[PDB]
């Protein structure tokens, strides 16, 4: 059960030296060679560190590695931290006739700071409900950063099943937009009091209320 | 500010031929009646030069951002003064210093800064309704600049803003260079009555300015002026006119030129040295008139193509098999020591397998092992349980690391470990294996002990019998078939490599490329890096020799080691480029003669003669060649070669 | 400089058999170790299988043990991977990995790869719902219009309004994956509310795998 433990978001820093630690638990990683793999997002991966102390030809000398047997961890150090570092890194080992890979450590961050999110509702019409369907869509747009949570509130109890949300997409306004879909039945639509779809952001919460009375 | 253009139908660029164009003064000195040769960047004669159009009658507007090489040639046959100026730079994004040279209607300025350039700088000319004159108002060249170093204003050249569709009446040439950060501009206005296919006339370009800027230039763009009359709606989307204009862009490359000077020090004619054999003969003699006779201009040498290597055969496989495939393994306190030497090392089967669990190599890197030759190779072997495998590495401490086997801190070897539980243990377990638990002190590296005395722990001696405060340092190991993975037996073999003053006896495998013969190739047969052909010989060698020399003491016969063939070494070819000339005021063509190189084309006794037709009849000869064969110009009429008549 | 070309994917099958190929050039195929590595879209790297330079020894992970097979040959310089009894987890991008000395030196070689996805939905008729918000106040994201496309497979859908006559203000939200792995998306355009009855709004939806083109008029409730 050999595995490697390493973080997922580190080195978000401009222009200095930062170390990344990858460690194992089942056995000593210093017995065999451990290598670091470095991958373009959306393209083919490459390798920055091999043999645990050297680098391939053409790789800049900014990257370096070290081994600490006291803490049973492997350290990868990047010195330059230039503009060519937007990658996720992995640590790979070899226990016995098998290969084990790391989780992945994403490194990407090397006029108005706040935008009001415009939120809209589209309740199902008579055409939707006459075909034994009920699609409620929760739309959110113009938010920064794109880290939001969409929730649905019923008359007396929050729902858990039937709600799907997509990742935000980059539009032509230097902002992001996200959508949420809910599949429901007409029986609970007319047996409730007021429907609510709430969205949470960094120190912001916008809630909207509609009624089945049309 | 700037605007973007719309897609339309354009014309592809065409290619024209230069005719004695691109010659300027290479220095600021005076030479009178002097044929002086200098090394500088010019435009070669009869070279391919890139051509662009600018005539409206359609809608041709092509100004790409062409790369700036070492020196450019810009010739414009401007008539209606449609061209305005040039810009330079590297990225054109307000990050590096960039040039702005514009010949405006009032004055000429040279500003180098970080101007924010759009995708197509241009100047806009409007026709006024009340005023019957063309004036420029749209000064859309850049947005802004932050800071810069150099600025210059030239003379106020008068500019005509009226565009027509007639034939050209003036020709303007410009040369831009950048040596040691110094900007060089050469220009000269030359009137002509022509529209296309620039004449064969000669006109040297005088220097104009020597602006010190000291930046990098790799891209440049051209600025053009359009007109907005009452016919066009006035919008720069689909309706516009640009008159009739044309400009040529050429790139300079370094060549050697022979320049002729007159009594007032003006350049009249130029002769190249790498264009024509006649031109080479003219420029080597430092004269514009060549008489009849033999002449030597340069030499000719063939170059090697490939590089073959054939190391001798390797078959001395090291005894790595039985040291790894050993039925019996010694105890840890009595670890075996085997010396391996005088064999060709083969680690290829060692790393290609995967039955082993540890392949760490301290000191030296295992990625290059076949290219390393060592003097002595040692190999130890002992069995240890899976827990005490990390204790083998130097630096760590433990029971095995300090009482049974200690490694030095400067180890340059490798450690091989693998698991063998079924072979080393039966159903009842193995109890034949001994290890040390107690010692008087620590153990020095590469030291083993065999004594099985009674370990003393307290102060009172036990008189050499079993009792309290003194026990057996040597103890047995218990093994189980169903125990843990860490308690299973593991076999560990440690490799040690050392260098001494003795010659190296252990070497890695070598490679051998295929043998190519009868071609000018390069070979390295363990004693020389010789380049030449490898012919098949007819002389046998005694069965102890690898080399071979001649009377002149030159290695020209080396035996191939892997099939035992005797191959000769011969230099590829060399010689000189001789030329025969009919003379002055008689002909213009020459014929190339090689002194001893073996190949319209006639195979003469005195080498290879090309460009001269051999004829069987014999006349009296005038230009000697050699071996009873001369050359002459005889009836049109061409250069002939024949046997001379006594 | 070593070329690696992979072309073995591009189709969906539940529990079937698939054949992936990696082509290599620029080196000697019969002297270095070989491997295969896959990664999930949006997840980390994981190892799949490895094979010796002569094909004598092959190993896989315990998740794919029992199934899967790998074979090689040195005459035509190609690597063969065959899969059987696929599951829903097998949506991954497969790279053919090349070694130098053994399993300790490193992967260090990742062919560009081929996108491989598996799904059970072959082709179903899309559902069109041009929602008409007759009653809606101002100061909102959408004044009054709505179009919804639901229950279609696979991507993509050509969404047009008024046969492509209008193109300003059209915003099409990306498709979302439901609990059954089904795509759904909506497109909104900002138009004045005074033209609800004075202008005809038709939502055009075209699906190329389903060869269906449905134009539906928008009528306020
Ligand atoms: C110990 O014996 C085994 C068994 O033959 C050797 O393993 C073979 O290695 C050769 C190398 O030429 C391969 O061609 C065979 O395929 C291998 N056979 C098996 C069954 O493993 C091994 O090389 C020997 N150990 C040493 C160090 O010589
Ligand atoms: C110039 O180049 C073009 C194509 O690159 C070729 O067709 C043409 O013959 C060249 N001109 C000369 C004088 O060689
Ligand atoms: C002509 O153009 C130059 C280039 O910047 C400018 O400095 C000059 O002011 C212009 N002339 C007039 C009269 O505007
Ligand atoms: C500003 O001018 C100085 C010269 O005084 C120059 O070294 C510097 O590079 C300029 N600034 C920029 C951003 O180029
Ligand atoms: C100019 O460019 C050359 C080659 O690109 C480079 O060697 C040199 O350092 C550059 N100099 C400056 C001042 O940018
Ligand atoms: C150049 O020299 C020639 C030879 O005497 C003479 O005829 C001519 O006038 C001179 N030209 C000038 C510009 O001095
Ligand atoms: C060199 O070795 C090969 C096998 O490794 C053998 O076939 C060949 O005959 C040898 N060459 C000699 C003995 O000249
Ligand atoms: C010159 O070369 C040709 C072909 O390579 C050959 O037939 C001829 O014999 C050679 N001449 C001499 C004098 O060796
Ligand atoms: C010259 O004449 C002789 C007469 O026999 C003939 O054999 C030979 O081929 C001729 N040579 C040429 C080049 O015509």
Torsions phi, psi for B188 (to 5 deg): -160, 130
Determine how many CB atoms are found less than 10 A away from the CB of residue B100.
Answer: 22
Q: Indicate which atom in ligand 1 lies nearest the CA of residue B350.
A: 27
Dihedral angle over CA of B8, B14, B18, B24, nearest 10: 30
Q: Under DSSP, is residue C219 helix (H, G, I), strand (E, B) or coil?
A: coil
B170 DSSP β-pair partners:
B191
Half-sphere exposure (Cβ direction) of B515: Cα atoms closer than 13 Å: 17
Q: How many residues does chain C have?
A: 221
CA distance B4 to B118: 9
- Are the CB atoms for B525 and B558 separated by under 8 Å? yes
CB B547 within 8 A of CB B526: no
Measure the CA–CA gap between C8 and C12, rounded to whole angstroms: 12
- Phi, psi dihedrals of residue C59, rounded to the nearest 5°: -140, 150
For residue A189, report the phi and psi dihedrals to the nearest 5 degrees: -65, -40
Q: How far is it, in rounded angstroms, from Cα B205 to Cα B202?
A: 10
Exposure class string for A42-67: b at 16+ Cβ within 10 A, else e: eeebebbbbbbeebeeeeeebbbbee
**Edge to edge, what strands does the sheet with B35-42 contain?**
B35-42, B253-261, B267-272
Contacting residues for C45 by C-beta, under 8 A, at least 6 apart: A37, A39, A45, A90, A92, A101, A102, A104, C37, C39
Q: Is C124 in CB contact (< 8 Å) with chain B?
A: no
d(CA C22, CA C9): 11
φ/ψ of C163, rounded to 5, equals: 55, 35
C-alpha of C182 from chain center: 13
**Largest Cα–Cα distance in chain C?**
77
Q: Which atom of ligand 3 is nearest to the CA of B102?
A: 4
Question: B559: Cβ–Cβ under 8 A, 6 or more apart, which residues?
Answer: B541, B545, B546, B548, B565, B566, B567
Taking one residue from A and the other from C, the number of pairs with CB-CB distance under 8 angstroms is: 122
- B435: its two tokens: 């290890």
Helix (H) or strand (E) holding B280: helix B277-284
Angstrom distance (rounded) from CA B55 to CA B164: 10
Q: Distance, in angstroms, between A11 CA and closest chain B CA?
A: 28
CB neighbour list of residue B457: distance below 8 Å, 6 or more residues apart: B438, B469, B470, B471
Q: Report which of B531, B511, B525, B530 is spatially closest to residue B564, judged by C-alpha positions.
A: B525
**Residue B525, token pair as written in the block:** 């047969």
Q: Which of B360, B365, B419 lies at the smallest CB-CB distance from A31?
A: B360
Helix (H, G, I), strand (E, B) or coil at B577: strand
What is the residue-wise DSSP string for B376-405? EEEEEEEEEEGGGGGGGSTT--SHHHHHT-
In angstroms, rounded to a whole number, what is the distance separating the alpha carbons of residues A193 and B638?
Answer: 111
DSSP B641: E
* B251 φ/ψ angles, rounded to the nearest 5 degrees: -115, 135
Instruction: Give the strand pairing for B613-614 and B638-643.
Output: parallel
With CA atoms as reference, report the closest residue to B457 among B444, B480, B473, B442. Answer: B473
Least CB-CB distance to A101: which of C45, C131, C188? C45
* Tokens 């991954």 -> residue: C92
Longest dimension (CA), chain A: 72
Which of B220, B198, B244 shows the shortest CA–CA distance to B81?
A: B244
Whether B210 contacts B182, CB under 8 Å? yes
Sign, Cα dihedral of B78, B89, B51, B245: negative
List b or e across B208-230, with b for residues whose CB sees 16 or more CB atoms inside 10 angstroms. Answer: eeebebebebebbbbbbbbbbee
- Short-list C56, C58, B51, B179, CA closest to C48: C58
Q: Is the dihedral of CA A160, A166, A167, A172 positive or negative?
A: negative
Contact B122, B109 (CB under 8 A): no
As a whole number of angstroms, the distance between CA A2 and CA A7 comes to 17
Cα atoms in the 13 Å half-sphere on the side-chain side of B267: 24
The Cα A31–Cα A69 span in angstroms is: 10
Residue whose pair of structure tokens reads 């150090």 in the numeric block: A77
Q: Which residue has the tokens 């024209």?
A: B16
Most distant pair of Cα atoms in chain B: their distance: 134
Reduced to 3 states, what is the DSSP secondary structure of residue B249?
A: strand
- Phi and psi at residue B512, to the nearest 5°: -145, 115
Q: Name all chains with 3 or more CB-CB pairs below 8 Å to chain A.
A: B, C
Q: Which atom of ligand 2 is nearest to the CA of B46?
A: 13
- Report the alpha-carbon angle B637-B641-B644, nearest 5: 120
Quick one: DSSP state of residue B467? B
Question: Token pair for residue C61?
Answer: 């992970």
Handedness of CA C14, C17, C23, C24 (dihedral sign): positive
DSSP at B59: -
User: What CA–CA distance (Å, rounded) separates B280 from B273?
Assistant: 4
Please work out, in degrees rounded to the nearest 5, the angle formed at the alpha carbon of residue C33 by the alpha carbons of C27 and C39.
100
Q: Is B364 on the interface with A (CB under 8 A)?
A: no
Residues B134, B137, B142, B147, CA torsion sign? positive
The whole-angstrom separation of Cα C40 and Cα C43 is 5
User: What is the rounded CA–CA span in Å between residue A187 and residue B222?
Assistant: 73
| Cα–Cα nearest to A31, from B358, B545, B270, B37 | B358
Q: Which two tokens stand for residue B53?
A: 């159009």
Distance CA B465, CA B456 (A): 11
Q: Compute the distance between CA of residue C187 and CA of residue C130 in angstroms, rounded to an integer.
A: 10
Say how far residue A96 (Cα) sits from the centre of its chain: 33
For residue A145, cis peptide bond before it (omega within 30 degrees of 0): yes
- State the Cα–Cα distance between residues A207 and B436, nearest whole angstrom: 75
A84 contacts A38 by C-beta, under 8 angstroms: no
Distance CA B507, CA B213 (A): 59
Pair A138, A180: CB distance under 8 Å: yes
Instruction: Tell me which chain B residue has its CA closest to the CA of residue A34.
Output: B360
CA distance B432 to B478: 9
Cβ atoms of B364 and B499 within 8 Å: the answer is no
Structure tokens at B483: 């125990």
Q: Is B22 exposed, middle or buried (0-12, 13-18, 19+ CB in 10 A)?
A: buried
Torsions phi, psi of B403, nearest 5?
Answer: -115, -20
DSSP 8-state assignment for residue C194? G
Distance from residue C73's CA to the centre of ligand 7 (Å): 26
Quote the ligand 3 centre to B154 CA distance (angstroms). 12
B436, β-bridge pairs: B474
Specified resolution (Å): 3.2
Distance CA C146, CA A181 (A): 15
Alpha carbon distance B596, B302 (integer Å):
13
| Cβ proximity of B108 and B102 under 8 Å | yes
HEC string for B470-532: EECCEEECCCCCCCCCCCCEEEEEEEEEECCCCCCCEECCCCECCCCCCCCEEEECCCCEEEE
Residues B623, B632 contacting (CB under 8 angstroms): yes
Token pair, residue B80, equals 């209606």
Q: How far is the CA of B557 from the centre of ligand 7 (A)?
A: 21
Residue B514 φ/ψ region, left for φ over 0, alpha for ψ in the -120 to 50 degree band, beta for the rest: beta
Instruction: State the Cα–Cα distance between residues B135 and B162, nearest whole angstrom.
Output: 9
- For residues B175 and B250, is the Cβ–Cβ distance under 8 A? no
Q: Which residue of C has its CA nearest to A166?
A: C176
Taken in order B40, B44, B48, B54, the sign of the CA dihedral is positive
> How far apart, in whole angstroms, are the C-alpha atoms of residue C150 and residue A179?
14
Strand partners, A9: A106
Nearest 10 degrees: CA dihedral of B516, B517, B520, B521? 30
How many degrees, rounded to 5, is the angle at CA B36 between CA B30 and CA B40? 90
Secondary structure (3-state) at C163: helix
User: CA B174, CA B179: separation in Å to the nearest integer?
Assistant: 16
Does ligand 4 lie within 6 Å of residue B17's CB atom? no
3-state helix, strand, coil in chain B (%, to 5): 5, 40, 55
Tell me how far apart the alpha carbons of residues B337 and B323 are, in angstroms, rounded to a whole number.
10
| Residue among B166, B137, B143, B142 nearest B236 (CA) | B137
List the beta bridge partners of residue A92. A35, A101
Q: Do you know the residue count of chain B?
A: 646
Q: Which residues does B406 contact at the CB level (< 8 Å), separation at least 6?
A: B442, B443, B444, B445, B446, B447
A26 interfacial to chain B (CB closer than 8 Å)? no
Asked if the Cβ–Cβ distance from B419 to A96 is below 8 Å, we say yes
Cβ contacts of residue B50 below 8 Å, gap of 6+? B13, B15, B66, B248, B249, B250, B251
Q: Is the peptide bond before A17 cis (omega within 30 degrees of 0)?
A: no
Distance from the Cα of B393 to chain A's closest Cα (Å) equals: 9
**Chain A neighbours among B 365-394 (CB < 8 Å)?**
365, 367, 389-390, 393
The whole-angstrom separation of Cα C216 and Cα C147 is: 10
C-alpha B377/C-alpha B340 separation (Å) is 5
- Cα of B187 vs its chain's centroid, Å: 36
- Minimum Cα–Cα distance from C54: chain B residue: B352
Question: What is the separation of C-alpha B431 from the centre of its chain, rounded to a whole number of angstroms?
Answer: 66
Across the A:B interface, residue pairs with CB atoms under 8 Å apart total 24
Place of tokens 């100026």: B85
Using an 8 Å Cβ cutoff, are A205 and A199 in contact? yes
**Cα three-residue angle B169-B174-B178, rounded to 5 degrees:** 175
Concatenated DSSP letters for B285-346?
A: TTSS---SEEEEEEEEE-----EE-BPPP---B-S-HHHHS-S----STT-EEEEE-SEE--
Residue C107 CB partners (closer than 8 Å, separation 6+): A35, A37, A47, A92, A99, C35, C37, C97, C99
CA pair distance B361, B497, nearest whole angstrom: 11
Cβ–Cβ < 8 Å for C96, C6: yes
Q: How far is CA B159 from CA B85, B132, B156, B162, B558, in A?
A: 12, 16, 9, 9, 78
DSSP structure class, residue B147: -
Distance of CA B98 to the CA centre of its chain: 30
Taking a C-beta distance cutoff of 8 angstroms, is the pair B494, B379 a contact? yes
Interface contact C102-B367, CB threshold 8 A: no
Q: Tell me how far apart the alpha carbons of residues B526 and B555 are, in angstroms, rounded to a whole number.
A: 13
DSSP state of B248: E
What token pair was written down for C151?
Answer: 């229950």
DSSP codes, chain A: ---EE--SB----SSS-EEEEEEESSS-TTSS--EEEEE-TTS-EEEEEBTTTB--TT--TTEEEEEETTTTEEEEEESS--TT--EEEEEEEESSS-EEE---EEE-----S--PPEEEEE---HHHHTTT--EEEEEEEEESSS--EEEEE-SSSB--SSEEEPPPEE-TTSSEEEEEEEE--HHHHHSSS-EEEEEEETTEEEEEEE-S--
A167 touches chain B (CB under 8 A): no
Structure tokens at C62: 């315990």
């Amino acid at each position: 059960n050999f595995m490697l433990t390493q973080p997922h978001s580190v080195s978000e820093s401009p222009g200095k030296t930062v170390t990344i630690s990858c460690t194992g638990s089942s056995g000593s990683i210093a017995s065999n060679y451990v290598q670091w793999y470095q991958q373009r997002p959306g393209s083919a991966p490459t390798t920055v560190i091999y043999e645990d102390n050297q680098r391939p030809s053409g790789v800049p000398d900014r990257f370096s590695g070290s081994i600490d047997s006291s803490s049973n961890s492997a350290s990868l150090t990047i010195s330059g931290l230039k503009t060519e570092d937007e990658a996720d890194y992995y640590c790979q080992s070899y226990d016995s006739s098998n290969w084990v890979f790391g989780g992945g450590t994403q490194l990407t961050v090397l006029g108005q700071p706040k935008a009001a999110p415009s939120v809209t509702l589209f309740p199902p019409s008579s055409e939707e409900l006459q075909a034994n369907k009920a699609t409620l869509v929760c739309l959110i747009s113009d938010f920064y950063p794109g880290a939001v949570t969409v929730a649905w509130k019923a008359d007396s109890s929050p729902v858990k099943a039937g709600v799907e949300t997509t990742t935000p997409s980059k539009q032509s306004n230097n902002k992001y937009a996200a959508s949420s879909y809910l599949s429901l039945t007409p029986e609970q639509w007319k047996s409730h009091r007021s429907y609510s779809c709430q969205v949470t952001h960094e120190g912001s919460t916008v809630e909207k209320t509609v009624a089945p009375t049309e | 500010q700037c605007v973007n253009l719309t897609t339309r139908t354009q014309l592809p660029p065409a290619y024209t031929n230069s005719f004695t164009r691109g010659v300027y003064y290479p220095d600021k000195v005076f030479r009178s009646s002097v044929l002086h040769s200098t090394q500088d960047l010019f435009l070669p004669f009869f070279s391919n030069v890139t051509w662009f159009h600018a005539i409206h009658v359609t809608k041709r507007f092509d100004n790409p951002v062409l790369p700036f090489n070492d020196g450019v040639y810009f010739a414009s046959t401007e008539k209606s003064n449609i061209i305005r100026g040039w810009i330079f730079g590297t990225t054109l994004d307000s990050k590096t210093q960039s040039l702005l040279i514009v010949n405006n209607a009032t004055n000429v300025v040279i500003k180098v800064c970080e101007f924010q350039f759009c995708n197509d700088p241009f100047l806009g000319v409007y026709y006024h309704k009340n005023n019957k004159s063309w004036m420029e108002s749209e000064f859309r060249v850049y947005s802004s600049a932050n800071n810069c170093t150099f600025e210059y204003v030239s003379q106020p050249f008068l500019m005509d803003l009226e565009g027509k569709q007639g034939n050209f009446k003036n020709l303007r040439e410009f040369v831009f260079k950048n040596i040691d950060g110094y900007f060089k501009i050469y220009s000269k206005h030359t009137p002509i009555n022509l529209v296309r296919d620039l004449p064969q006339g000669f006109s040297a370009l005088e220097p104009l300015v020597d602006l010190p800027i000291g930046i990098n230039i790799t891209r440049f763009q051209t600025l053009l002026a359009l007109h907005r009359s009452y016919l066009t709606p006035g919008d720069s989307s689909s309706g516009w006119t640009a008159g009739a204009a044309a400009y040529y862009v050429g790139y300079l490359q370094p060549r050697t030129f022979l320049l002729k000077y007159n009594e007032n020090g003006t350049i009249t004619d130029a002769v190249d040295c790498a264009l024509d054999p006649l031109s080479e003969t003219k420029c080597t003699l430092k004269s514009f008139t060549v008489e009849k006779g033999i002449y030597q201009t340069s030499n000719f040498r063939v170059q090697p193509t490939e590089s073959i290597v054939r190391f001798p055969n390797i078959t001395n496989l090291c005894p790595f098999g039985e040291v790894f495939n050993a039925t019996r393994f010694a105890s840890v306190y009595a670890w075996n020591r085997k010396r391996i030497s005088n064999c060709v090392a083969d680690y290829s089967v060692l790393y290609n397998s995967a039955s082993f669990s540890t392949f760490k190599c301290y000191g030296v890197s295992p990625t290059k092992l076949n290219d390393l030759c060592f003097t002595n190779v040692y190999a130890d072997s002992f069995v240890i349980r899976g827990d005490e495998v990390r204790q083998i590495a130097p630096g760590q401490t433990g029971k095995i690391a300090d009482y049974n086997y200690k490694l030095p801190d400067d180890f340059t070897g490798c450690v091989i470990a693998w698991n063998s539980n079924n072979l080393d243990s039966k159903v009842g377990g193995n109890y034949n294996y001994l290890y040390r638990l107690f010692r008087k002190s620590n153990l020095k590296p590469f030291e083993r002990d065999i004594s099985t005395e009674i370990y003393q722990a307290g102060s009172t001696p036990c008189n050499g019998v079993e009792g309290f405060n003194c026990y057996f340092p040597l103890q047995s190991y218990g093994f189980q078939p169903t125990n843990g993975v860490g308690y299973q037996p593991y076999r560990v073999v440690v490799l040690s490599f050392e260098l001494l003053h003795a010659p190296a006896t252990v070497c890695g495998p070598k490679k051998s490329t295929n043998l190519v013969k009868n071609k000018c190739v390069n070979f390295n047969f363990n004693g020389l890096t010789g380049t030449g052909v490898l012919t098949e010989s007819n002389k046998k060698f005694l069965p102890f020799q690898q080399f071979g020399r001649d009377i002149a003491d030159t290695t020209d016969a080396v035996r191939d080691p892997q099939t035992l063939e005797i191959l000769d070494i011969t230099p590829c070819s060399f010689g000189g480029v001789s030329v025969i000339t009919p003379g002055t005021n008689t002909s213009n063509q020459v014929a190339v003669l090689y002194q001893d190189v073996n190949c319209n084309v006639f195979q003469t006794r005195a080498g290879c003669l090309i460009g001269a037709e051999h004829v069987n009849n014999s006349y009296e000869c005038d230009i000697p060649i050699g071996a009873g064969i001369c050359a002459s110009y005889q009836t049109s009429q061409s250069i002939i070669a024949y046997t001379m008549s006594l | 400089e070593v070329q690696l070309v992979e072309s073995g994917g591009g189709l969906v099958q539940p529990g079937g058999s698939l054949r992936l190929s990696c082509a290599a050039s620029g080196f000697t195929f019969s002297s270095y170790w070989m491997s295969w590595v896959r990664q999930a879209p949006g997840k980390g790297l994981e190892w799949v299988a490895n094979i010796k330079q002569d094909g004598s020894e092959k190993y896989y992970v315990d998740s794919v043990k029992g199934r899967f097979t790998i074979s090689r040959d040195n005459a035509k310089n190609s690597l063969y991977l065959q899969m059987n009894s696929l599951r829903a987890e097998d949506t991954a991008v497969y790279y053919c990995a090349r070694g130098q000395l053994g399993p300790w030196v490193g992967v260090d070689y990742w062919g560009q790869g081929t996108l491989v996805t598996v799904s059970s939905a072959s082709t179903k008729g899309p559902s069109v719902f041009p929602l008409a918000p007759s009653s809606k106040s101002t100061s909102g994201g959408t004044a009054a219009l709505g179009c919804l496309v639901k229950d279609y497979f696979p991507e993509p859908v050509t969404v047009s309004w008024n046969s492509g006559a209008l193109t300003s203000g059209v915003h099409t939200f990306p498709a979302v994956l439901q609990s059954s792995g089904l795509y759904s998306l909506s497109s909104v355009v900002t138009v004045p509310s005074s033209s609800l009855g004075t202008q005809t709004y038709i939502c055009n939806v075209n699906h190329k795998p389903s060869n269906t083109k449905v134009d539906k008029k928008v009528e306020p409730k």
